[PDB]
Design a protein around this nucleic acid. Structure first.
Lengths: 90, 144, 85, 196, 94, 257, 214, 140, 203
RNA sequence: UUGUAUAUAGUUAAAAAUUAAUAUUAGUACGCAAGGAUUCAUU
RNA sequence: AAUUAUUAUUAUAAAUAUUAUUUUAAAAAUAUAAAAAUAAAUUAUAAC
């Protein structure tokens, strides 16, 4: 009748692993090369030197006081930025 | 039309024609009950005469439709007759051909061919996102 | 809805027919009798309710438990037939 | 939620769209919009009958057999539109199609609408019902120099209504038979309707 | 034809000055059943954290849209109808 | 302006105009269907006669209808006639339908499951070639003196091709209300259906017993105590159905035995 | 029932047709609209005493019976009181609340198997017998001599000893294949009239006759 | 019933004629007067009292059955007061005159109890629809 | 009064408004009405020794704590059928018939229970003595049926092959008792031949 | 934001809600023959 | 109870009798009574 959603949701326990990894390794250093090299092509309007300072600051404020997955969430968002060709920062 | 009374002008021939986009399934094999103002009763007075499809409804000799509306007591039998008499020939060209610019045939497969490619990326997002993580996990299980 | 010793049946609530609501004699489904059926389950209204849609009567709970048990097994007789003819 | 649950228990779904792309439509519309109108015929005359449609369903055959006699063109060349009995009016406002036919009007005349200028009302109703006359598709209205008169749809109508009002006075007397043995007590060439 | 539209998705657009409102939602009423000037749709449109049932007069220049009928299976309309009631009932500040 | 000059909540009048507008608070039932049950004054409705409740309004309407299906006439009072001629046709728009649900649509309404058959038997063969307005509504020149209520004489129209009242006459009633009523003298030995008498002979023969006579007389005692004037004393009360009196009706009694 | 209204054209059964009902030729290209087939309501079939005992007769010859043999056996009779495979599904829903049929499925297989309940099997033999008490006697050629039965009177005891199913390979079709020649010679007509019982419920009354079609 | 958390009826704590199709509640075919051993008519008489308990004792539905003139106490030959009887050695013994309370007479009517007829005596015992979980109506 | 007034009278209404006093009738509005109207007589509570028979058995299976509300749970578990004529109060009639006649005394620890069986645990031993080994005997007497219920098929394993070879016995005649009125004479003889073409070679 | 003063007027418009006229003609049904058509086919 | 009136005068016995009194074709106030909102039966409502 309705409880089909119960049949659905209990069927969407779906423990395909996916905990955001919380990168505690050089993986952070990868993007901070890929970013400043993928940005260095695009920063026509916005400042090239303001943009480095904020990627620094985001790589401490998110490392300092956040959780595990939300750091694997931020890092995944670093991946999805240049995948989105940028964070629209033109 | 339904709300039309008595005669059928040469205009609402258009209103019948314009509205053939929103009826793509319809064909000369469609059941007569799909006809403007061909309600429940009139159909049963039609079926009693072995008349089923829009196509046969165009064959009536102005005397079946007359003895229908004036002897079988089925009303508005003239505003339905002129309807099948109107869309049969643009529907008859649906028996032989579908859309002419629909199709865009080289396009219609490239829309279909990618929908597999597309709806197989979410299912794989359930996989590609985690197996890429499983590695980013196993890449560090060793470093310590 | 109306059940006695032999078989069962489905009725309704024609507002003129009230003195039959509780105990209407009926030809039993089984071999033969003019059995005096009783009233078991409500099964909703005949006419609509003023400015209330058709679902406001509601058959009953156990009446849902009835057709889902009396008929119920369309998976047990999908043989020779489905909802079509 | 006035839509009852189980309105559509199991639905195949008839598309009701025609290419869900919003751009292909409005172009498939052009044909059926700018395309050719696909059902219309042009009425030649009106055949006004006195009795109602249950008094003609057996005598409505010879009228074809008698207007084909008159137009010379054989039978099975004429398409008589189905009978349309007008409303049993009480107010009797004129102009519409569900209206009865007065003895005088725009096309009812024996080409005598000067009656409208020289009279102060209309003659009473002649035909309670009516019936149209069609032919295989051709032109509409023209004056010809080879028929000694007009020769078109309207002419095939005008040069029939003039002949018909010759029998109301008292070689083809089909227009005289059409009065007595068949039923026609009114003839009128309508206005050529229009669409967008 | 009432059964046909219910549950079918809507694209919208809606003009407006800052930018057009691009919003996707399910149809639920179809007030007129043909091309008359009445129109009306009553979509549900579930934009974001906000739910917003609304009406489209279906003749407006700047209020344009489009309906599609593939995922508009009536058995999807029933769920959308439940999704709103929950959002409706459980937003009463009670 | 954009809102109608009158909002949703305002009662127009009786005999008012249409005054069309957009509104979204109507259609309680399957309106316009052979049993709409709507009752009011604005034209799209049936005239709401004086009943004690909407339910009791239906009960009146039901038993007014299943007396038009036994005796194809009726003498109703006031606003029951318009709302019966309207309902008399609904039954006949429902007779021609004949689908497996109509008889279950009409078995719910009538207080009688027999008349439904008679309704579905005669009316197709009888009202086949009549479009609409099947029932006549003649207003009688009399009036119920009790309450000045104009009595109308509703009846069904086509009764020559009918089956059970093919030649009956309704100038005045029968001799004692339990006899086959007067017939048009041209058709004396006309064969009525063989079953619409089995529900009559079975019935017209309960007013023939001595116990009914002891009801007919007792009923007077009930009335003079109940204050109804002009009721002669239960002492000198002629019996309704006697033995010798019946022979006059035993005259045309040589049909099957 | 028609040629191709609800089931595509070519679905005709050699069963008891209804009286007065012509085979109304539906043209070939005809189709419903999926939203017209929405309601799809049909005529209710007679599930009464005549079909039931008949339904049991073929279930009594075959105490277990499977899906297709449920209808594939009704073709093997002199008189049939079915019109469709849905008229077979209809009475079965009745015969369950009659306690006459509790059919199940065998776990080793995956088909559903008929079985007259043992809470009623001893008595339904009379019901199949009260059909049978004159089912043999009314036969015509039986009662025309003795050498037709006497050319077989001894086989019934010697069949089921050493040639039991040996005859059953023929006792199904060949003895019934002539009924197919006879089905084209004498169907039954499900003449019906609707009515209402004094409770008010709608129902029909079916006057079953054999059609002398020849 | 295990109605989820005390969700039973509010005002009477019980409704009238809750749907009894789950258990047909039919009189037996083999039967006996619990105290006098007399066969009992099926369903068209009131001359037998059904005692349909949660448990089941006497015939096949096994709610007790007496004849209307067979309910009396056995050793003390009286109506049973308050309708709380006591089956002593397979005989319903009047509660008092059974329990060693050797009474000599009741007050109201000494040879016909106030029993009901046709299961009416025990109409406040279970047999609602939610006795067993009965969720098959709701699942998938 | 809306339910009564609204034209189309519902189904609940017709059952609710009924307060008649005929047999098998609405009990609520027979109870609800006047005390001069109700013949809703006293609830026949069974205090049978049978109600003792489903008493001394259970406690020696579970004689712990709180046996006065979930004791009926045992009655809702141990179910050939319960015990309480009225689960509500007959299960509360269970202790008083047990407390009297010197059968059961209570047990109180954080709550009240039915434990300790009051020194009658000997008559609980020879109660269960009249249980399993009484249930053991009767379930095999129907196995005497079920030692021949196997034969019930086996006695008609041949007969269902026999009396379905009798089901043709008449039809074979009637197959041709109607052929008479259609006259094949070739499909007629062979349909009698192909049956007797192997009938006499059988045995 | 200009006049005037170190800060800024002063004017006009757009937006936050419904518009009103007394008296010269035949009368004891429903001002609907009612299910919004001034008879949609005849009975 | 002034009555052919708000009424089962009920000490008792009871349970499938259709067991025999309720006008009216309009409109407001009022009177009873009534779909929607700031886990429960409630509201107020001077709203259809």
């Amino acid at each position: 009748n309705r409880r089909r959603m119960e049949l659905e949701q209990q069927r969407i326990e779906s423990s395909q692993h996916l905990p955001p990894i919380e990168p505690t390794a050089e993986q952070a250093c990868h993007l901070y090369r890929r970013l400043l090299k993928e940005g260095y092509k695009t920063l026509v309007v916005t400042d090239k030197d303001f943009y480095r300072r904020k990627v620094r600051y985001e790589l401490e404020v998110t490392s300092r006081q956040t959780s595990s997955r939300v750091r694997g969430i931020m890092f995944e968002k670093g991946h999805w930025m240049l995948e989105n060709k940028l964070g629209g920062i033109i | 039309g339904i709300a039309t009374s008595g005669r059928v002008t040469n205009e609402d021939r258009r209103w019948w024609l314009v509205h053939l986009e929103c009826a793509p399934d319809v064909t000369p094999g469609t059941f007569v009950s799909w006809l403007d103002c061909c309600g429940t009763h009139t159909t049963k007075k039609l079926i009693e005469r072995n008349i089923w499809t829009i196509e046969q409804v165009a064959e009536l000799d102005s005397d079946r439709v007359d003895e229908l509306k004036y002897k079988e007591g089925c009303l508005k039998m003239d505003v339905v007759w002129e309807h099948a008499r109107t869309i049969i020939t643009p529907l008859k060209q649906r028996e032989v051909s579908g859309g002419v610019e629909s199709q865009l045939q080289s396009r219609i497969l490239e829309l279909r061919k990618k929908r597999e490619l597309e709806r197989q990326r979410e299912l794989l997002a359930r996989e590609r996102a985690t197996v890429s993580d499983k590695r980013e996990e196993t890449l560090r299980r060793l470093r310590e | 809805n109306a059940c006695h010793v032999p078989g069962d049946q489905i009725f309704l609530v024609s507002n003129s027919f009230t003195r039959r609501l509780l105990t209407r004699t009926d030809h039993c489904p089984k071999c033969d009798r003019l059995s005096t059926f009783r009233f078991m389950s409500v099964s909703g209204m005949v006419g609509r309710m003023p400015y209330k849609p058709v679902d406001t009567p509601g058959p009953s709970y156990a009446t849902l438990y009835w057709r889902k048990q009396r008929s119920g097994k369309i998976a047990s007789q999908p043989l020779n037939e489905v909802c079509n003819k | 939620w006035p839509y009852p649950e189980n309105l559509v228990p199991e639905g195949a779904t008839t598309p009701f769209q025609s290419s869900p792309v919003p751009s292909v439509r409005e172009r498939i519309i052009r044909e059926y919009a700018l395309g050719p109108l696909f059902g219309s015929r042009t009425p030649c005359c009106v055949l006004g009958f006195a009795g109602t449609a249950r008094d003609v369903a057996a005598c409505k055959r010879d009228v074809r057999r008698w207007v084909a006699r008159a137009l010379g063109k054989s039978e099975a060349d004429v398409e008589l539109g189905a009978l349309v009995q007008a409303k049993e009016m009480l107010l009797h406002r004129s102009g519409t199609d569900e209206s009865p036919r007065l003895g005088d009007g725009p096309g009812s005349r024996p080409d005598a609408e000067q009656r409208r200028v020289t009279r102060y009302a209309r003659l009473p109703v002649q035909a309670r019902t009516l019936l149209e006359v069609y032919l295989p598709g051709e032109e509409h209205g023209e004056v010809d120099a080879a028929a000694d008169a007009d020769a078109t749809i309207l002419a095939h109508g005008y040069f029939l209504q003039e002949q018909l009002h010759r029998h109301m006075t008292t070689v083809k007397s089909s227009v005289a038979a059409l009065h007595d043995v068949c039923g026609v007590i009114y003839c009128e060439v309508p206005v050529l309707d229009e669409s967008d | 034809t009432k059964e046909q539209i219910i549950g079918s998705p809507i694209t919208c657009n809606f003009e407006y000055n800052p930018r057009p409102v691009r919003l996707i939602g399910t149809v639920m009423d179809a007030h007129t059943e043909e091309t008359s000037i009445k129109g009306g749709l009553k979509v549900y449109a579930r934009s974001e954290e906000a739910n917003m049932m609304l009406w489209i007069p279906a003749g407006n220049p700047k209020l344009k849209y489009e309906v599609t009928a593939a995922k508009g299976s009536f058995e999807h309309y029933l769920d959308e109808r439940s999704k709103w009631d929950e959002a409706w009932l459980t937003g009463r500040a009670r | 302006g954009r809102p109608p000059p009158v909002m949703g909540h305002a009662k127009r009048m009786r005999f008012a105009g249409v005054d069309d507008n957009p509104s979204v608070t109507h259609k309680p039932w399957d309106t316009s269907e052979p049993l709409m049950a709507d009752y009011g004054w604005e034209r799209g409705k049936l005239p709401k006669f004086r009943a004690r409740s909407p339910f009791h309004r239906q009960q009146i309407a039901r038993r007014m209808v299943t007396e038009l299906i036994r005796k194809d006439y009726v003498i109703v009072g006031g606003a029951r006639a318009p709302a019966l001629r309207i309902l008399a046709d609904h039954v006949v728009e429902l007779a021609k339908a004949g689908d497996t649900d109509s008889r279950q649509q009409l078995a719910y309404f009538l207080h009688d499951p027999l008349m439904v058959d008679k309704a579905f038997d005669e009316y197709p063969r009888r009202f086949r070639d009549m479009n609409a307005k099947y029932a006549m509504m003649t207003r009688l020149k009399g009036r119920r003196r009790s309450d000045n209520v104009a009595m109308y004489f509703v009846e069904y129209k086509n009764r020559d091709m009918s089956d059970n009242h093919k030649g009956e006459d309704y100038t005045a009633g029968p001799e004692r209300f339990f006899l086959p009523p007067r017939i048009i003298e041209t058709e004396k030995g006309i064969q009525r259906p063989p079953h619409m008498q089995m529900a009559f002979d079975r019935w017209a023969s309960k007013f023939k017993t001595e116990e009914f006579h002891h009801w007919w007389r007792l009923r007077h005692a009930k009335l003079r105590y109940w204050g109804v004037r002009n009721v002669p004393h239960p002492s000198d009360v002629d019996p309704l159905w006697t033995e010798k009196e019946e022979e006059e009706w035993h005259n045309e009694m040589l049909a099957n035995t | 029932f028609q040629a191709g209204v609800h089931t595509p054209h070519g679905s005709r059964y050699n069963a008891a047709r209804m009286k007065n009902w012509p085979v109304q030729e539906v043209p070939q290209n005809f189709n419903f609209t999926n939203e017209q087939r929405f309601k799809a309501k049909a005529v209710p079939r007679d599930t009464g005493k005549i079909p039931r005992d008949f339904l049991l007769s073929v279930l009594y010859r075959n105490q277990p019976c499977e899906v297709a043999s449920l209808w594939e056996h009704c073709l093997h009779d002199p008189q049939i009181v079915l019109d469709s495979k849905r008229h077979l599904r209809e009475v079965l829903q009745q015969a369950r609340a009659e306690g006459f049929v509790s059919f199940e499925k065998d776990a080793v297989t995956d088909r559903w198997v008929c079985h007259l309940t043992r809470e009623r099997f001893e008595e339904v033999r009379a019901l199949v017998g009260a059909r049978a008490e004159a089912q043999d006697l009314y036969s015509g050629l039986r009662g025309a001599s003795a050498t037709e039965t006497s050319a077989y009177s001894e086989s019934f005891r010697e069949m089921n000893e050493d040639t039991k199913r040996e005859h059953f390979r023929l006792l199904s079709e060949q003895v019934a294949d002539t009924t197919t020649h006879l089905r084209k010679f004498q169907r039954m007509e499900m003449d019906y009239l609707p009515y209402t019982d004094l409770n008010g419920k709608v129902n029909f009354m079916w006057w079953y006759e054999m059609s002398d079609t020849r | 019933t295990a109605v989820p958390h005390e969700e039973a009826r509010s005002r009477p704590h019980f409704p009238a004629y809750t749907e009894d199709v789950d258990q047909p509640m039919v009189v037996p075919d083999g039967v006996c007067c619990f105290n006098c051993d007399k066969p009992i008519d099926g369903d068209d008489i009131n001359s037998y009292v059904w005692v349909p308990s949660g448990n089941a004792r006497v015939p096949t539905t096994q709610g007790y059955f007496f004849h209307v003139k067979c309910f009396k106490c056995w050793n003390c030959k009286y109506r049973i007061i308050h309708n709380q009887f006591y089956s002593k050695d397979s005989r319903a013994w009047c509660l008092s005159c059974a329990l060693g309370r050797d009474i000599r007479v009741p007050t109201r009517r000494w040879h016909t109890s106030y029993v009901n007829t046709h299961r009416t005596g025990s109409r406040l015992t279970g047999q609602f629809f939610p006795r067993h979980r009965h969720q098959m109506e709701f699942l998938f | 009064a809306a339910a009564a007034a609204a034209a189309a009278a519902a189904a609940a209404a017709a059952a609710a408004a009924a307060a008649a006093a005929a047999a098998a009738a609405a009990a609520a509005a027979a109870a609800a009405a006047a005390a001069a109207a109700a013949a809703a007589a006293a609830a026949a509570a069974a205090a049978a020794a049978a109600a003792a028979a489903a008493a001394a058995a259970a406690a020696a299976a579970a004689a712990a704590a709180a046996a006065a509300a979930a004791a009926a749970a045992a009655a809702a578990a141990a179910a050939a059928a319960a015990a309480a004529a009225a689960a509500a109060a007959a299960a509360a009639a269970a202790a008083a018939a047990a407390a009297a006649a010197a059968a059961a005394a209570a047990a109180a620890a954080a709550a009240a229970a039915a434990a300790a069986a009051a020194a009658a645990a000997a008559a609980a031993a020879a109660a269960a003595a009249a249980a399993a080994a009484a249930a053991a005997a009767a379930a095999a007497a129907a196995a005497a049926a079920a030692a021949a219920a196997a034969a019930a098929a086996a006695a008609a394993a041949a007969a269902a092959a026999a009396a379905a070879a009798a089901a043709a016995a008449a039809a074979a005649a009637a197959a041709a008792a109607a052929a008479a009125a259609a006259a094949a004479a070739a499909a007629a003889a062979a349909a009698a031949a192909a049956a007797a073409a192997a009938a006499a070679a059988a045995a």
